[PDB]
Amino acid sequence: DPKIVNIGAVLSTKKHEQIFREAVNQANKRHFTRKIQLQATSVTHRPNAIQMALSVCEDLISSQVYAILVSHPPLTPTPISYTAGFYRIPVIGLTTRMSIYSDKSIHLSFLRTVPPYSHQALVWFEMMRLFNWNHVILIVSDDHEGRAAQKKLETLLEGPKADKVLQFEPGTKNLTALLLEAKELEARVIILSASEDDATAVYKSAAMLDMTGAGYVWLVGEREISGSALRYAPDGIIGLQLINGKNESAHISDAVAVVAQAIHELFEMENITDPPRGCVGNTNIWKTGPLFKRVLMSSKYPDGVTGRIEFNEDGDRKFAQYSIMNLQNRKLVQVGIFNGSYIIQNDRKIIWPGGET
Amino acid sequence: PPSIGIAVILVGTSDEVAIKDLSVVPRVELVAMNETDPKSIITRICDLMSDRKIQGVVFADDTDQEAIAQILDFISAQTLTPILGIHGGSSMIMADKDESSMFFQFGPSIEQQASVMLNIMEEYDWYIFSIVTTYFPGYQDFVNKIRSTIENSFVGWELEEVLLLDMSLDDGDSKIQNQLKKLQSPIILLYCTKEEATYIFEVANSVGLTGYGYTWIVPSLVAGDTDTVPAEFPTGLISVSYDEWDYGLPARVRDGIAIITTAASDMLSEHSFIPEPKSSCYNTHEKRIYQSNMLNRYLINVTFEGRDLSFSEDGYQMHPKLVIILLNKERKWERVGKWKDKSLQMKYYVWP
Ligand SMILES: *[C@@H]1O[C@H](CO)[C@@H](O[C@@H]2O[C@H](CO)[C@@H](O[C@@H]3O[C@H](CO[C@H]4O[C@H](CO)[C@@H](O)[C@H](O)[C@@H]4O)[C@@H](O)[C@H](O[C@H]4O[C@H](CO)[C@@H](O)[C@H](O)[C@@H]4O)[C@@H]3O)[C@H](O)[C@H]2NC(C)=O)[C@H](O)[C@H]1NC(C)=O
Ligand SMILES: Cc1ccc(Cc2noc([C@H]3CC[C@H](Nc4ncnc5[nH]ncc45)C3)n2)cc1
Ligand SMILES: *[C@@H]1O[C@H](CO)[C@@H](O)[C@H](O)[C@H]1NC(C)=O
Ligand SMILES: *[C@@H]1O[C@H](CO)[C@@H](O)[C@H](O)[C@H]1NC(C)=O
Ligand SMILES: *[C@@H]1O[C@H](CO)[C@@H](O)[C@H](O)[C@H]1NC(C)=O
Ligand code: NA
Ligand code: NA
Ligand code: NA
Ligand code: NA
Ligand code: NA
């Protein structure tokens, strides 16, 4: 007769709900569960935020969950983050890449198995070191996301330096004033941080200003080589792709493995209190919440499906792996991988805007 | 004139009888709410919408539960219904309100309070100080306000230290204690929640920082319900409070009803329409292309009985008459000053 410790989840589909139920089962199989045994509790995303918040209370907090796994909906993890945060119940983001969830003030008990987009600056930095791009021009959107990338790239740079940083208003379709300012500089390495629709805007104007050809280097993230951004992207661009970043199944495995370990680690300590049973009539935080957060934050699982799972000072994923993509003859060709710490070039040659620098 | 449905939600003990004392007319309904958790508040407001068809909500509570501001902002933006946090946890300082928010609070802002704190310091020539914040939303806006104010003052202010305490983790390692030992200033400005402040103070006492020669200035939310005084609060603690004394609950409810009614009358007598009170919280996704926060331009600058009830760009009251309070020996909050209009009027020249 062990103690049943529930783990909650807000997932995309019933297949994903079954994958979660299996991941938890396997965890119980692989751990010593005489004392504590896990139980999966889950729901799929609700049509709207009010219904989603209500679902967390009715379906998960009602079951006294110790943590809630959240996949990015096919709507945001925020109603989940706020409801769970209210009680200090940790939330594990599986596919949310937006840098705002790294905000400890608003998202006060949140960890993610995927890094925020701002973390691609770690790859660009290694790339700059490798190709000896000591002078760069950084173009960012004047939104939380764009500033997150700047703030992060700037941190790594403070060797290689950013000659100028240019911010633009999200939704601006004519950026030839921004891009002409960039063309005047000696630096020909342009780094871009912008949403798919804003990346398109930059791409079109840069082409009109003949800045997408030989001489220039375009270094970019995942969003900027996705959807409409890819239709107007200059041939020779360098983009990124977070390996398994959209694989909710791989992230369910890994999050459960991590949570299962942390639960068992937690119960090695004394005076572990249960979370509140439901929302109604409960306005007190879970006293064990903050300790369980510390335990999770400091958890390492190296044999994860998506790699070495570790969390940074913001509970964001460390040692994420990316595909270094190069647009060659309007085809997205992988030219290497950022393995979590090092750049590994593959036998496919990089074609730079034009030919070879 | 046509009628508008206004719901007055009152969490806790209230004199409903005392409380019961244009182009459109209000049809008010006093609602008593028992619980303040997310489910209860979301459910209560949603059921009221479902029956009466509510043009706006006037909310008041007796709690030290500042999350009610967040819950109410969330409800407000999702349903696109005006909500006025007229007292308690609902009127306390918050994170950045939603782009689509229609939440307005009777309390003072982060930056307003921060200035009031420096005004107290200038008065008693308390120029040497430190700041200690947690991650509570706006902590950077608080530090930045002080810093900007300080760096343009031809006064000899000296901000010795700025501590950032992570309260989201367990303090078994004694990290907070080691950080608090860094403090050397006679004046400490503490920005955090009432719950966080009780822990911080228990620690600060261990390190001998709550005693004589150490003064702690704190914002409205740390004092909160002046009738709930944590034992760990230091005697001689200075705080800002929104005048629960002279701006009593019935006046606030009346002013809340006035704001919604005026705003609605204005939009009607200008656009020949008002926003339709949506009868569901479970259809928000479907009908958002039909809804907007248009009423905010009318809600933000209402004047009634000559009293200027206008709100800031961030949804806090524009001109609040704040009250400076001191936690005395009999562990009770005492009035020691007033902040009316850019000017501070204190009780004492020298503190006893
Ligand atoms: C991402 O890619 C990096 C780069 O390759 C990987 O890091 C290397 O990982 C390997 C294997 O774990 C490490 O190899 C071991 O190196 C030891 C000596 O290391 C020193 O020298 C290297 C090179 O100059 C430096 O990089 C390093 O910092 C040290 O100063 C050897 O002692 C080891 O040999 C023993 O074990 C091997 C098997 O592991 C046996 O074959 C041997 O016979 C022997 O008993 C071994 O060669 C290497 O040190 C790591 N390099 C760095 C930079 O840290 C990451 O592992 C990879 N990550 C992922 C997720 O794939
Ligand atoms: C749908 C819904 C919406 C709102 C609510 C209430 C709520 N509970 O949590 C939150 C978040 C908002 C930011 C807030 N951060 C902090 N609150 C207190 N003390 C703190 N210290 N450091 C940071 C901090 C937590 N909101 C619940 C459900
Ligand atoms: C997603 O990850 C799982 C491993 O957990 C695996 O079954 C599947 O092959 C992966 N999907 C893709 C597209 O590779
Ligand atoms: C709230 O408390 C009062 C106490 O008299 C009670 O009558 C009322 O039924 C309670 N509300 C609910 C929702 O049950
Ligand atoms: C405030 O309201 C009055 C209503 O008489 C209006 O004339 C004035 O222009 C408004 N001010 C602003 C800044 O909108
Ligand atoms: Na087992
Ligand atoms: Na975090
Ligand atoms: Na290659
Ligand atoms: Na009309
Ligand atoms: Na709309």
Query: What is the strand order of the sheet A65-70 is part of?
Result: A36-44, A3-11, A65-70, A91-93, A110-112
Report d(CA A155, CA A140) in Å as an integer. Answer: 15
The answer to whether the CB of A332 is under 6 A from ligand 3 is no
Burial grade of A213 (CB within 10 A; 0-12, 13-18, 19 or more): middle
Domains and CATH numbers, chain B: 1-107+242-320 (3.40.50.2300), 108-241+321-352 (3.40.50.2300)
Would the CA dihedral through B200, B229, B39, A105 be positive or negative?
A: negative
3-state helix/strand/coil string of chain B: CCEEEEEEEEECCCCHHHHCCCCCEEEEEEEEECCCCHHHHHHHHHHHHHHHCCCEEEEECCCCCCHHHHHHHHHHHHHCCCEEEEEHHHHCCCCCCCCCCCEEECCCCHHHHHHHHHHHHHHCCCCEEEEEECCCCCHHHHHHHHHHHHCCCCCCCEEEEEEECCCCCCCCCCHHHHHHCCCCCCEEEEECCHHHHHHHHHHHHHCCCCCCCCEEEECHHHHCCCCCCCCCCCCCCEEEEECCCCCCHHHHHHHHHHHHHHHHHHHHHHHCCCCCCCCCCCCCCCCHHHCCCCCHHHHCCCEECCEECCECCCCEECCCCEEEEEECCCCCEEEEEEECCCCEEECCCCCC
CB A217 within 8 A of CB A188: yes
A265 touches chain B (CB under 8 A): no
Going by DSSP bridges, is the β-strand pair B307-308/B303-304 parallel, antiparallel, or unpaired? antiparallel
Q: Helix, strand or coil for residue A60?
A: helix
**What determination technique applies here?**
X-ray
Distance in angstroms (rounded) separating the CA atoms of residues B327 and B4:
43
Question: Which residue type is seen at B148?
Answer: S
Give the type of residue at B321. K
State the Cα–Cα distance between residues A252 and A201, nearest whole angstrom: 36
Q: Which one-letter DSSP state was computed for residue A269?
A: S
Q: In terms of Cα–Cα distance, which of B223, B202, B176, B219 is closest to A290?
A: B176
- Termini Cα distance of chain A: 68
- Give the pair of three-digit tokens for residue B330: 């009999």
Centre of ligand 9 to C-alpha B269, Å, is 10
DSSP one-letter string for A136-166: EEEEEESSHHHHHHHHHHHHHH---EEEEEE
- Tell me the residue ranges of DSSP E strands in A103-145: 110-112, 135-141
CB contact under 8 A, B169 and A294: yes
By CB neighbour count within 10 A (0-12 exposed, 13-18 middle, 19+ buried), where does A224 fall? buried
B312: burial class by Cβ within 10 Å (0-12, 13-18, 19+)?
A: middle
Say whether B37 and A108 touch across the interface (CB within 8 A).
Answer: no
Taking the C-alpha atoms of residue A201 and residue B106, their distance in angstroms, rounded to an integer, is: 43
CA B57 centroid distance within chain: 17
SS3 A114: coil
Q: How many CB atoms lie within 10 A of CB B27?
A: 15
Q: What is the C-alpha separation between A172 and A312, in angstroms, rounded?
A: 34
A321-348 burial, b at 16+ Cβ within 10 Å, e below that, comes to bbbbbbbbeeebeebbbbebeebeeeee
Nearest to residue B313, comparing CAs of B43, B1, B101?
B101
Sketch the domain layout of chain A as residue ranges: 1-115+249-320, 116-248+321-357
What distance in Å separates the CA atoms of residue B2 and residue A2, rounded to the nearest whole number?
Answer: 64
The breaks in chain A (C to N more than 2.5 Å) occur after 74, 158
The answer to whether the CB of B127 falls within 8 A of the CB of B95 is no
Residue type, A29: K
Which residue has tokens 């508008």?
A: B4
Closest CA to B59 of B256, B246, B242: B256
Contact criterion met (CB below 8 Å) for A197 and A299: no
Alpha-carbon distances, residue A66 vs A46, A273, A287, B324 (angstroms): 21, 10, 12, 42
Residues in chain B: 352
Question: Distance between CA atoms of A356 and A328, rounded to whole angstroms?
Answer: 12
Pairing verdict, β A217-220 and A189-193: parallel
Q: How far apart (Å, rounded) are the C-alpha atoms in residues B177 and B154?
A: 35
Torsion of CA B153, B154, B155, B161, to 10 degrees: 60
Q: How far apart are CA B116 and CA B107, in angstroms?
A: 13
The C-alpha atoms of residue B68 and residue B14 are separated, in whole angstroms, by 18
The CB of A122 under 6 Å from ligand 3? The reply is no
Q: Classify residue A164 as exposed, middle or buried by CB count within 10 Å of its CB (0-12, 13-18, 19+).
A: middle
Q: Sheet harboring B128-133: ordered strands across?
A: B158-164, B128-133, B187-191, B215-218, B238-242, B322-327, B333-339, B344-346
Specify whether domain A1-115+249-320 bears CATH 3.40.50.2300.
Answer: yes
Is the CA virtual torsion B213, B214, B217, B221 positive or negative? negative
DSSP code, position A211: -
Quote the radius of gyration of chain B (alpha carbons, Å): 21
Q: For residue B43, what are its two tokens?
A: 């459910």
B292, amino acid identity: S
Using H for helix, E for strand and C for coil, what is the string for A2-50?
CEEEEEEEEECCHHHHHHHHHHHHHHHHHCCCCCEEEEEEEEECCCCHH
The answer to whether A191 and A128 are in contact (CB under 8 A) is: no
CATH for A116-248+321-357, options being 3.40.190.10, 3.40.50.1110, 3.10.20.30, 3.40.50.2300: 3.40.50.2300
Exposure string of B189-201, with b = 16+ CB inside 10 Å and e = fewer, is bbbbbbbbbbbbb
Say yes or no for a CB contact (<8 Å) between A82 and B38.
yes
Distance between CA atoms of residues A193 and A140, nearest Å: 5
- Domain pair A1-115+249-320 / A116-248+321-357, same fold: yes
**Closest to A187 (Cα-Cα) out of A215, A150, A154, A153:** A215
Q: Do A104 and B168 touch (CB under 8 A)?
A: yes
**Integer Cα distance of A28 and A187 in angstroms:** 56
| Start-end of H helices in A276-324 | 289-297
Characterize the bridge pairing of strands B56-60 and B83-87.
parallel
Q: Which residues of B are annotated as a binding site?
A: 87, 244
State the smallest CA–CA distance between residue A77 and chain B in angstroms. 14
8 A C-beta contact, residue A106 and residue A158 = no
CA distances from A356 to A214, A216, A234, A236, B352 (A): 8, 11, 15, 10, 79
Tell me which residue in A104, A281, A282 faces B135 most closely, judged by beta carbons. A104
Cα–chain center distance at A279: 29
Residue B149 CB partners (closer than 8 Å, separation 6+): B114, B115, B118
Q: Which helix (H) or strand (E) holds A201?
A: helix A196-208
Which residue's CA is the nearest one to ligand 3's atom 4? A250
Tell me which residue of A121, A150, A93, A79 sits closest to A316, measured CA to CA.
A93
Structure tokens at A36: 């504590």
SS3 A174: coil
B92 close to ligand 2 (CB < 6 Angstrom): no
Buried b (16+ CB within 10 A) or exposed e, B56-66: bbbbbbbbbbb
Chain B touched by A281 (CB under 8 Å): yes
Task: Indicate the resolution in Å.
Answer: 3.0
Kindly state whether B289 is in contact with chain A, defined as any CB-CB distance less than 8 angstroms: no
Q: Residue B32: how many CB atoms within 10 A of its CB?
A: 13
Contact A293, A265 (CB under 8 A): no
Q: At what angle do helices A176-183 and A196-208 cross, to 10 degrees?
A: 60
Nearest CA to ligand 2 atom 10: A82
Strand, helix or coil for residue A344: strand
Helix (H/G/I), strand (E/B), else coil: A267: coil
C-beta separation of B134 from B165 below 8 A: yes
Residue B344 Cα, ligand 7 centroid: separation in angstroms? Answer: 40
